[PDB]
């Protein structure tokens, strides 16, 4: 379940270092380069005051794109707490300088059990992306195409009633999740598979 | 990148909210920090990450982003408060401090005793003449003091010296030193030294023989 | 258990040179990042310089490029800055930090960097009180430390005995280029004739201490 991730990441450019948490009990951070040299580059973090640390760097392909990244092991991926990361050229020059609180960059799962049913107005159902935590504190939003009409829900939430549709027309629906709270923050996750629903006569 | 504090000065009393903003130039990072820095002791860190409060770091003591703004908060001032501030930015290799902004305290008005010293003779055998005008224990610091010799308006001819808050009176007290020669001392007789402060003027003078 | 150290400052003439030293106790030196930050006298915060952990990388602050250089022995667990072509604009109290939380947690207590051209010592005159235009509640006399460079003066009455409404007014740059100063003091008017009063002035640099006695204004 990577790859994707990181892919969908990555088109957030390249002056910010991309990072992100899978579990709240991990961290990864890369960025994509050129193929034409490869460079030498130095990952080091702090974790508050504690002495600052050095972190192996890895190189991989794309395709002929090539990917720098560095995992940060469990223990001091601890949240709530002002994590820094520099990246530096052998030459000196810093390529990047971050600060993340670990719990702010989280990326989830796609959602995934959504249904559809309708006379009336249409109640679509839906389960917590899974194998993650926390699932009473998750962020959905929906999209309503037929032509883009997106639903916003909050904290909790695994269904919706559909007021104001049409009728005569194909409509699919999906849902995206991401941590939202005063100590959850990330990116969006994948859009859900989507479902499709034909609506009444009208 | 430029980091621009505001107030560079302000005055409130014992017990108010206070909120101290510092303005980013270029694309900011969230590495903004908040220092304390009392007369003679180095800076104290009090506030990192914009928002995290250092620990041992009063609650009172509060950081907030709204964009390009970034602002220290103090919720309900306490005398060991009263102190110079400043933002500190940390952006890819460069450092930057904010201009500085010191918070003093509101007090009573309080006018001062005003008392005005001839030079003494040691001086004047050395061909110049400090004429010295001290306002001692007075608020607020804004106050306005003229020289005038043989009742002719002074300009440029003086300085001024100012302490800080009196730890107890929380007043201050002000010098205005009239710098003239030898020569142009001995051909006058007045010296008058005028402390104005709001609706008030306060002239102490001497006459040049007067003992 | 962490500590900073400085030394190192002191006078210098323009151009001069100076290696201030930053020693560290209580954390490794190699493992952190360490700042050297200077204050004007009575300025804002300037940062001046840093070096990294493990590659020693030297970052300098445009006004200080070339110059100065920062540097680590980290057998001694000390960090150095070497000041050369020093001006006079250089004049400042140097600290050194340490890099945690995002900015600088642990600072030491700083070094006092003084560039001069010419140390003077300073003049004393008494700021006389007078015994028949006093009352005033109390009275007020003073000594009146003029011309003098570079900073600083240090000004006390009768050599510590007497501190509690003493108010010895920051230095003022007279047109002449040499600093000035005054130190005055409120005292009971009935204790003129009876109490003597001694300011003492001493100026380091030129190693001048002045015991004055101010006397009322008789004549
Ligand atoms: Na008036």
Known sequence: KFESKAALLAARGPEELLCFTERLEDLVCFWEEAASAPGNYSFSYQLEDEPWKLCRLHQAPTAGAVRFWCSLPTADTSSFVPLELRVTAASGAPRYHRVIHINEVVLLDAPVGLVARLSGHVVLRWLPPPETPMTSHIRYEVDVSASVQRVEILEGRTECVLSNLRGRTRYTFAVRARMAEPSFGGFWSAWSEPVSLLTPSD | IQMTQSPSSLSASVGDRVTITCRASQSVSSAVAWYQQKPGKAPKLLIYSASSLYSGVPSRFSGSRSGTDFTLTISSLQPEDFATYYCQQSSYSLITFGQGTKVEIKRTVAAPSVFIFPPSDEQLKSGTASVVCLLNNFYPREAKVSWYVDNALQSGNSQESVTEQDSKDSTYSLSSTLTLSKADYEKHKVYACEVTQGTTSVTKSFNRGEC | ???????????????????????????????????????????????????????????????????????????????????????????????????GYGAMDYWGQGTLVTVFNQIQGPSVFPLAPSSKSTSGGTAALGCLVKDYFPGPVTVSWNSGALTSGVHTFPAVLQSSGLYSLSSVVTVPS???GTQTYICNVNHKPSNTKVDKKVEPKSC
């Open chain 3, 1 to 99: 258990e962490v500590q900073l150290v400085e030394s190192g400052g002191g006078l210098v003439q323009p151009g001069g040179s100076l290696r201030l030293s930053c020693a560290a106790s209580g954390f490794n030196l190699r493992s952190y990042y360490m700042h050297w930050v200077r204050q004007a006298p009575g300025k804002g915060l300037e940062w001046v310089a840093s070096i990294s952990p493990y590659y020693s990388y030297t970052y300098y602050a445009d006004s200080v490029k070339g110059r100065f250089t920062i540097s680590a022995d980290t057998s001694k667990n000390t960090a150095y800055l070497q000041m050369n072509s020093l001006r006079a604009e250089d004049t400042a109290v140097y600290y050194c930090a340490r890099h």
């Open chain 3, 190 to 192: 009935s204790s003129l």
